[PDB]
Amino acid sequence: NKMEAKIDELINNDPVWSSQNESLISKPYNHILLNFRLNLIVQINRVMNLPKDQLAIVSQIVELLHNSSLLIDDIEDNAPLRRGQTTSHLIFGVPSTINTANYMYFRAMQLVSQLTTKEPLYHNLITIFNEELINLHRGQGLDIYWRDFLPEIIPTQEMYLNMVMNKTGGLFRLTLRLMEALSPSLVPFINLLGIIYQIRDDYLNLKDFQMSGFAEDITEGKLSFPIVHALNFTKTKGQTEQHNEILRILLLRTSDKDIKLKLIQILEFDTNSLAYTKNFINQLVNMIKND
Amino acid sequence: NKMEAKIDELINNDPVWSSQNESLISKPYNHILLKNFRLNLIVQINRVMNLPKDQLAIVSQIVELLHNSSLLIDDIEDNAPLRRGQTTSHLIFGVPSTINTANYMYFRAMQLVSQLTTKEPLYHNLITIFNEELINLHRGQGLDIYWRDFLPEIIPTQEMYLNMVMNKTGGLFRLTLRLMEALSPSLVPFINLLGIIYQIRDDYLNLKDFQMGFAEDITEGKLSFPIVHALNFTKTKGQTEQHNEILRILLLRTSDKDIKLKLIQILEFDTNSLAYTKNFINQLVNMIKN
Ligand SMILES: O=P(O)(O)C(O)(Cc1cnc2ccccn12)P(=O)(O)O
Ligand SMILES: O=P(O)(O)C(O)(Cc1cnc2ccccn12)P(=O)(O)O
Ligand SMILES: [Mg+2]
Ligand SMILES: [Mg+2]
Ligand SMILES: [Mg+2]
Ligand SMILES: [Mg+2]
C-alpha cells in the first residue's frame, strides 16, 4: 500500500538530483579549476565578430572539454602533477575522476543549445562538437596504443603528425569551427598552431629537464616528437644498440633522473633529435611569421 | 621547401584516419562483444512504437554502444577482474586504452543519432534525450561511486539509494524508450520500474549466487540494496557492533571467501536483509503482474 505509492510517485517523476549531490560529484573538476585559452578565443574573435554573450558560452564549453580531457589524460598518462599541483585521480581516485570528467563532456554538449535557437545551425554546431571529440579520441587512442604496446608499432614522423592532427588539432579545430559557424577559413592555421603546440610541448618537456622540469614524458614512455625521430634515425643508421636502449628506457616507466638524463643526452649527441626538433619548430613558426 | 609542402598538404586536409587505426582503437570494445535479451526488449517494446526495422536497427546499435562502453568504464571503476567469466578489457589492454575506447564509442554512438532522422525539430529532441539521459547515468553512477569511496562518511537510506538507481540504471533504459517513443509513427514509468527491479535484482543475485558467484560487491564495497538495508536496520535497532562490523567488512575491500561469508551471514541471521530484498523485488514485479 504505502510502498507501492512511494514507488509510484518515484517512477512517475524525473529522477531526484540535489545541488548537494551536484557539488559532491564535481570535486575532481573543481580541483583542476585551480586566461590564455580565453585570450586565444578573443583574438580569433577579432576576426569572427561573435557577440560577447555567445563568445562567453563558446568559452564555457571549451573550458569544460579542456579540463575534462586533462582529468582523463592524467589518468591515461599516470601523471602525479598538473599545474604544480597533485593530480585529481590521486586525490579522489580514478573512479570518481573518470566519471566526473565524462559527466562534464555531457554538460558541455548540453551548453551547445545555448548558442542558438535556429534548428539548422544548431545541428551544425553539434556535428562540429561531435566530430572534433571523435577526432580527439582517435589521436589520443593512437598515442596511448603506440606507447602501451611499444615496441609493437614504431611510428614514423608522418604517423606522429597524423596522430597530432587528431589528438591536439581536435580541440583547436573545435573552438574555431564553432566560432566560424557562429560568425555573422582559419582551420589550416589553427591546425598548424596545434602541431607547433604539441611539438613544443614534447620538446620543452625534455629541454627544460636537460637545462634544469621533470621530463615526465620519459617516465610515461610516450612516442614524443623527439623520440620518434631518434627511433627512426637509429633504425635507419644501423644503431641497433641505441635503438634498443631507447626502447628499454621508455619501457622502464622510470623516474630516475640519471636514467632520464642519459636518454636525453642520447637524443642530444647521438641522434641529434633535440636540434632536429628545435629546427623543425622554427621552420613551422616561420611558415606563419613568413605569411 | 619539401618540408613546407608537406606540412601544407597536412593542415589543408582532414586529419588522416585509417581502417587499421580504427581497428587498433577498437580492440577494447571488440573484446567485450564476445559476451540478445537487450535486442529482444527493443523488439518487444516496438510492438507499441512500430518503428521501421531500418530505424530500429540504429536505435539498437546506439544502445549496444552506450551499454557496452559504460560496462567497459564500470569495470575500471569497480576494479573488476571478470565480466561474464572472461577477463575484463582493462586488464588486457590497460586502463588508458580501455577508457579512451569507451569514451570514443560514446561519441560514435552520438553520431548514429543523426542517422535516425533528418527532420530538424525531431533531431533536436533526439539529441536532447540522448544528452539528458547520459547526464543522468553519470550522476547516479557518480553518487554510487561517491558513497562507496567515501564510506563511511555517508550511509544512504533506502530512499537515497532509489534516487541513485533512478539516475544510474534508469538512464539507458529511458534513453532507449524515449528515443523510440519520439521516433514512433508513455511507457517511461514502466521502464523506470524495470530498471529498479533490474538493479535491486543485480545487487541481490551477487550475494545469493555466492551463497548457493564471487560476491564481488562485497569486495568492491558498494552500498547495494541489501547492505543499505542492513546498515540502516542495525542503526535503527541500535545494534552498534553489528553495524560496525558490516562497515568494517566493506572497508576491507576483501577477496576472502570466509570474510565474505561472514557478512552475508550477518545479513542472513542478524538483519534478514537478503529476505527483505527478495520480498522487495517480488512486490515490485507484482505492480507489473497485477
Ligand atoms: O599532459 P600534456 O598537457 O602534456 C598533453 O599535451 C595533454 C593533451 C594533448 N592533447 C590532448 C588531447 C586531449 C586531452 C589531453 N591532451 P599530452 O599529450 O603530453 O598528455
Ligand atoms: O557491474 P554490474 O554489471 O553488476 C552494474 O549493474 C553495472 C551498471 C548498472 N548500472 C549502470 C550504469 C552505468 C554503468 C554501469 N552500470 P553495477 O551497478 O553493479 O556497477
Ligand atoms: Mg596524454
Ligand atoms: Mg599527459
Ligand atoms: Mg559494476
Ligand atoms: Mg559500478
Curated annotation (Swiss-Prot), chain B:
Q: What is the effect of changing L10G?
A: Monomer and homodimer. Monomer
Name the residues that bind Mg(2+) 2: D74, D78
- BP GO annotations: farnesyl diphosphate biosynthetic process; geranyl diphosphate biosynthetic process; geranylgeranyl diphosphate biosynthetic process; isoprenoid biosynthetic process; protein transport; terpenoid biosynthetic process
GO cellular-component term (any): mitochondrion
Q: What is the effect of changing I11G?
A: Mostly monomer. Exclusively monomer. Reduces enzyme activity 1000-fold
Q: Which reaction does it catalyse?
A: isopentenyl diphosphate + dimethylallyl diphosphate = (2E)-geranyl diphosphate + diphosphate; isopentenyl diphosphate + (2E)-geranyl diphosphate = (2E,6E)-farnesyl diphosphate + diphosphate; isopentenyl diphosphate + (2E,6E)-farnesyl diphosphate = (2E,6E,10E)-geranylgeranyl diphosphate + diphosphate
Essential cofactor(s): Mg(2+)
Ordered alphabetically, the record's keywords are:
Carotenoid biosynthesis, Cytoplasm, Isoprene biosynthesis, Magnesium, Metal-binding, Protein transport, Transferase, Transport
User: Binding positions for isopentenyl diphosphate?
Assistant: R38, H67, R84
* Compartments where located: Cytoplasm
Judged by the first EC level, this protein's enzyme class is transferase
**To which pathway does this protein belong?**
Isoprenoid biosynthesis; farnesyl diphosphate biosynthesis; farnesyl diphosphate from geranyl diphosphate and isopentenyl diphosphate: step 1/1; Isoprenoid biosynthesis; geranyl diphosphate biosynthesis; geranyl diphosphate from dimethylallyl diphosphate and isopentenyl diphosphate: step 1/1; Isoprenoid biosynthesis; geranylgeranyl diphosphate biosynthesis; geranylgeranyl diphosphate from farnesyl diphosphate and isopentenyl diphosphate: step 1/1
Other notes: Present with 2840 molecules/cell in log phase SD medium.
Official protein name in the record: Geranylgeranyl pyrophosphate synthase BTS1
